[PDB]
Write a protein that binds this ligand. Structure first.
Ligand SMILES: C[C@H](O)COCC(COC[C@@H](C)O)(COC[C@@H](C)O)COC[C@@H](C)O
Ligand SMILES: C[C@H](O)COCC(COC[C@@H](C)O)(COC[C@@H](C)O)COC[C@@H](C)O
Ligand SMILES: N[P@]1(=O)C=CNC(=O)N1
Ligand SMILES: N[P@]1(=O)C=CNC(=O)N1
Ligand SMILES: [Zn+2]
Ligand SMILES: [Zn+2]
Ligand SMILES: [Zn+2]
Ligand SMILES: [Zn+2]
Lengths: 422, 422
């Protein structure tokens, strides 16, 4: 029964802090006069940084851990990835999906992630993975709040009974409506698919998260429809456009015009740096574009943007340990957000901005909130990112649900010396 | 009571000419045998060039003289200009609009302009500026024939009650229906907005003048809809596409295909060189595009194109004295219309071509026409343009309404010498 977290640093605050817990909530946050001694019912943050939990705003738990089954994505493209997945989707079972999803979820718990939005492919007359994931959501609830997106991987209009399958997924309980307009057979299907998506979200009162313009095509502008529909319906906060990698290739004048709408609409954006750097630029020879959306410009304009991992060992990404600091590291480099302050503030892109994207209400280190928080063995955001630190403790509802004993490195010179990389 | 203009040159004609006036009209035009002596009731053109009055086919009298109020357009872009104007539009009053409009109108009278088309922003639930401008039109009528365009600056579909406000502006008496399809939230709104514009123009029997593709976006092709709708309705002469700066960036094959429609449709084009050179190319680094529409090619194809000033000391242009020869000078340079004949014929782009754009019937130096004409202290169009001459006399209905006594320059060398720059 934890009553207190002691010796904690807080981003943008001086000195150490004590965090009081009561009935699974944060009751008070008080400055310390100095380093406090450990007491019973206290958790020692050891002068580490305390932040709300990491968020994964974009992952595919139904595809996770399937890379190479039955074939590998040779070209490393989005489009071959979808073909490889279709082969694997034909082999899906209820137990297979739950086993793989739980494998990745456990890594996420270990990595201080307590909020996860997973897309699940509902281009499947059996809805096997969707129904299994609805179960996983209930099973993992003590540790992770899981959102499920009904994601029509093969299109709403371009796949047999796609719209009916999408609606059935919502009826069954999916939290978010997805779409994939750039993968529809025609631009017209793409636009119409978004109208159907927004109509479904309003009918069932659900969130929207579109795989939007994930393609190096300067003519792929489905994002303007997503934002306009959100604005018309006054539902900006409930709407996310994921990827928008085509925006990397837009001319500047169109982008400037578009940004007015993006700001007015209030929609959210997700960039997925690990996967984007791998899948984008694949049709260039040299020079090769980076292919990540306009993260720097969005931040400058006060548009909410955040980072997801997207894929863990699957047809679209052969790596991953589901680590958000690793995602952030890649994102800061590729987006050239490399000023000291930008790097230090980077934690926001995998915490607060992502919580906003998921429309979370109970999130942040503040009195009255659930005691959901993590402790990093680092002095600040810059230090955590630079040293790629693990999560020392993850606390949920005032209980410890994960812990890492950090590695210990020693060099043997004229005498043994501990190395902290500081 | 002027009965005659004597000692006049006419474009493309030899020697001097006498212009007879009767009841505010031109009664006859007769060749002179030589220089005639001044007589009572005669106006001496002093061997200057006589042409019909200058026309301003595109200006914003509601925004004129507001640059820097309350803030400056820092980026020098169309899009920031609109944001700055929105701030100023919130401060508009009836007297403010009339005072500023009249300030610029007086400069125009002084500059030999007797026909003016002003756009007025009707994205305003109060229609303050539109109603004030309807009054100004009546007040200035003895000196300038003013056309008012109901211009939905913030979009027809993308602004609250935009369509109803646009229709109310026409009901109140606006001469021309405007639109701004490239500023609408989506391409679909852009296209639909033009359908609504043409429907309104047919319902009220009005002209159309669209701010069309004023953006460095090669995908901005609203001009083809404007031309197709005009062609379908058989109303080409009544339709104008302003700016079309995106055409500067089109590929050549599409442009060739498009030009067939532009010619068949018979619509008019306005280019605005002073403003276009300033606002366009702002999203390029280097090299930087010029950004003016395809004026040279239009002229080669017999498509009617003309030049406007667009803005005078406002959020989109920090300069101006409302001078059409200055506009022409910029246009000839940027469009590279720099052959001797092209420069000499340049006056057409600010007289006859513009009169056609405004659909004027009573215009030109010909017997039976109103005695509306101006006198330039120049030998021909080339001379007028090269020396940037003022207007010596402006005559309207056979009465002098403006006059300039030209500057006199002297250099003091071994003796005083007059300098005429010839
Ligand atoms: C390591 C990992 O991949 C497997 O863990 C087993 C697990 C068992 O689910 C129990 C459920 C809540 O009723 C989840 O992890 C353990 C619990 C305590 O969190 C999921 O196994 C999936 C099979 C049964 O298809
Ligand atoms: C210099 C300029 O900016 C102001 O001129 C005053 C002017 C007075 O209007 C009289 C009207 C026809 O009833 C127009 O110019 C004079 C006339 C003779 O042409 C316009 O003033 C606007 C105010 C009253 O909000
Ligand atoms: N890269 P990603 O987000 C993963 C799976 N399917 C997609 O279409 N895109
Ligand atoms: N440059 P301009 O013609 C002037 C005002 N408003 C516009 O949208 N364009
Ligand atoms: Zn089951
Ligand atoms: Zn995805
Ligand atoms: Zn009034
Ligand atoms: Zn204009």
């Amino acid at each position: 029964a934890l009553q207190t977290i002691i010796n904690a640093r807080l981003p943008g605050e001086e000195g150490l802090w004590q965090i009081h817990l009561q009935d699974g909530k944060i009751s008070a946050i008080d400055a310390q006069s100095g380093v406090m001694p450990i007491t019973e019912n206290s958790l020692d943050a050891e002068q580490g940084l305390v932040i709300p939990p990491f968020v994964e705003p974009h992952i595919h738990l139904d595809t996770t851990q399937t890379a190479g089954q039955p074939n590998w994505n040779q070209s490393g493209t989005l489009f071959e990835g979808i073909e490889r997945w279709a082969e694997r989707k034909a082999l899906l079972t209820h137990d297979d999906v739950k086993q793989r999803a739980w494998q990745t979820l456990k890594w996420q718990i270990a990595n201080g992630i307590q909020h996860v939005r997973t897309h699940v492919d509902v281009s499947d007359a059996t809805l096997t993975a969707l129904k299994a994931m609805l179960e996983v959501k209930q099973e993992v609830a003590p540790w992770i709040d899981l959102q499920i997106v009904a994601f029509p991987q093969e299109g709403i209009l371009s796949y047999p009974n796609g719209e009916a399958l999408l609606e059935e997924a919502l009826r069954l309980g999916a939290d978010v409506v997805g779409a994939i307009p750039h993968f529809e057979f025609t631009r017209e299907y793409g636009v119409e698919s978004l109208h159907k998506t927004f109509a479904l979200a309003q009918k069932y009162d659900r969130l929207i998260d579109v795989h939007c313009d994930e393609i190096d095509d300067e003519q792929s502008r489905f994002v303007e429809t997503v934002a306009a529909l959100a604005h018309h319906e006054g539902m900006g906060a409930r709407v996310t456009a994921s990827h928008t990698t085509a925006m990397h290739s837009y001319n500047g004048a169109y982008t400037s015009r578009l940004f007015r709408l993006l700001k007015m609409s209030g929609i959210n954006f997700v960039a997925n740096p690990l996967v984007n750097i791998h899948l984008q630029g694949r049709f260039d020879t040299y020079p090769k574009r980076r292919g990540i959306t306009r993260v720097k410009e969005m931040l400058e304009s006060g548009i909410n943007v955040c980072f997801g991992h997207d894929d863990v060992f699957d047809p679209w990404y052969p790596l991953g340990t589901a680590n958000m600091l690793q995602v952030l590291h890649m994102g800061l480099h590729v987006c050239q957000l490399m000023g000291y302050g930008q790097i230090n503030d980077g934690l926001n892109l995998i915490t607060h901005h992502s919580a906003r994207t998921l429309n979370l209400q109970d999130y942040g280190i503040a009195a009255g909130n659930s005691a959901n928080l993590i402790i990093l063995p680092a002095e600040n955001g810059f230090d955590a990112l630079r040293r790629q630190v693990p999560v020392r403790y993850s606390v949920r509802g005032g209980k410890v649900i994960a812990s890492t004993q950090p590695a210990q490195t020693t060099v043997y010179l004229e005498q043994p010396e501990a190395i902290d990389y500081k």
